[PDB]
Amino acid sequence: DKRFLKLLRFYILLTGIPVAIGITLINVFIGEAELAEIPEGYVPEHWEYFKHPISRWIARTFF
């Protein structure tokens, strides 16, 4: 039982720490988009209608 919990803890943190650190760096050194009116005659890409950088990347890459 002790071994399983250590293994479960290790594999959750294996990617859990890189993701937690990666989000903190993204939030600090990139930041969220700021709301702006669509400039006249400009057509935004579908991924430009979202605020968070990770959300924009998800929509751009996969959706």
Partner: protein
């Protein structure tokens, strides 16, 4: 959906071309990768569904069921590889092939745009399921359980075939997007009463509705663990998913045709919940618990309100993980004592401390402790049936009491008290077993942090 159909198909050459000793490792790893990619189906819009092509579409209803389906396959391989260890290699691969082919049919079933295509795949799932129960079930009664399972389904599904073909002749299409726009009201007549019954009974038998449920306790007591997991988690939901779709074209006749089936469900859930208090076989008890939980889903679908449809969807997902957990927990005891009798091995918390925690967590979700998605789904149904008729709260409330009693009774009887003196082979929980339990409960409890993704189209 081809990005999921083809890699699912590729699991079969992978299993057959693997090294003899790597069939479980390879099939488990790659079906987890498929499960990972299934999260791309979360691209859902507020107005329109995700319409891939002429054959397949996904919306907020089928998407959570698709993700549950693809998640269950690696869990089923984990659960099966131990009791199949003695089986010869070719028959091990045939077992895995039946599981893979079941997933292929299921993902096509939940995304089929045309209702007759949905029918064929809805029926195709019987074949591998029947083979799994009758070929790899343990006891003599698996043959009878196979027959009851097969003929209960076909007795209802054949009339559905006639009704579906009849609808296409009259309307010109069975495409579900087309029916959304060309649906016409169903007028009162004896012809329409039987069209309604033909459109619904097949899904009722699968749910199962109280009175047509006797095949399900049989199937579970005889199925291998993987059979029980897929039966409880997904195959029951084929009925709910089917009902949620076909009720579109049955209005307003459902207003009065639903009454007998609401009475059977409302009273049925209290009967089946009460029955659980006296069950002597652990698998049979969990099976009767499913009938009670799914009676709520039938009521929710039949009263057709936004709150009831959201609750029905959440309940289907929540019950899928919980009932699959409970069967896996019961099976892990079976692999030690080789009996399903609940009263045989007692006081297991003294011998298996961590497994008793999984037992506690599974029981708490089964009785719908807030804020689990089990409770969210049940609560949304209770809220909507109260408006339908205030008196239903008495029946809903009584079932909540009985549900807690039998869930904790199962926990108390098997885990607490004194251990049985002569049972001296209770070996420590394996890493595989602990991982299997946590791969059920952890996604279940994580869904509480973002419930909207399991609430369905009405969200």
């Amino acid at each position: 959906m081809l990005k999921y159909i083809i890699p699912t198909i590729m699991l079969m050459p992978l299993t057959w071309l693997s090294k003899n000793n790597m069939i479980w490792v390879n099939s488990t790893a790659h079906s987890l990768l498929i499960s990972f990619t299934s999260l791309l189906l979360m691209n859902q819009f507020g107005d329109n569904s995700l319409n891939f092509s002429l054959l397949f579409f996904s919306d907020s209803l089928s998407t959570p069921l698709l993700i549950l389906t693809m998640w269950l396959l690696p869990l089923m391989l984990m659960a099966s590889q131990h009791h199949l260890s003695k089986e010869n290699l070719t028959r091990k691969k045939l077992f895995i092939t039946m599981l893979i082919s079941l997933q292929l049919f299921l993902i096509m079933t939940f995304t089929a745009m045309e209702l007759i295509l949905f029918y064929i795949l809805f029926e195709a799932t019987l074949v591998p399921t029947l083979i799994i129960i009758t070929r790899w079930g343990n006891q003599t009664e698996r043959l009878n359980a196979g027959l009851y399972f097969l003929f209960y389904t076909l007795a209802g599904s054949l009339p559905l075939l006639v009704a579906l073909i009849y609808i296409q002749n009259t309307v010109g299409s069975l495409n579900f997007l087309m029916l959304q726009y060309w649906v016409q009201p169903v007028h009162n007549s004896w012809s329409n009463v039987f069209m309604w019954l033909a459109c619904m009974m097949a899904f009722m038998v699968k749910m199962p509705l109280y009175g047509l449920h006797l095949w399900l306790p049989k199937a579970h007591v005889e199925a291998p663990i993987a059979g029980s997991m897929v039966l409880a988690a997904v195959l029951l939901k084929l009925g709910g998913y089917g009902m949620l779709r076909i009720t579109l074209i049955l209005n307003p006749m459902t207003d009065f045709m639903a009454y007998p089936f609401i009475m059977l469900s409302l009273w049925g859930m209290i009967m089946t919940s009460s029955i659980c208090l006296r069950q002597t076989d652990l698998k049979s008890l969990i099976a009767y618990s499913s009938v009670s939980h799914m009676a709520l889903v039938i009521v929710a679908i039949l009263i057709q309100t936004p709150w009831s449809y959201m609750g029905a969807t959440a309940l289907m997902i929540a019950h899928g993980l919980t009932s699959s957990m409970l069967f896996c927990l019961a099976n892990s005891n079976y692999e030690r004592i080789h009996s399903r009798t609940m009263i045989l091995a007692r006081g297991l918390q003294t011998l298996l401390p961590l497994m008793a925690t999984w037992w506690l967590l599974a029981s708490l979700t089964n009785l719908a402790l807030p804020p689990t998605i089990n409770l969210i789904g049940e609560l949304f149904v209770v809220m909507s049936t109260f408006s339908w008729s205030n008196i239903t709260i008495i029946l809903m409330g009584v079932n909540m009491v009985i549900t807690a009693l039998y869930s904790l009774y199962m926990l108390i009887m098997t885990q607490r008290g004194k251990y049985t003196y002569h049972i001296n082979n209770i070996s420590p929980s394996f890493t595989r077993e602990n991982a299997l339990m946590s791969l059920h409960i952890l996604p279940l409890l994580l869904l509480t942090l973002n419930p909207k993704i399991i609430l369905g189209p009405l969200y």
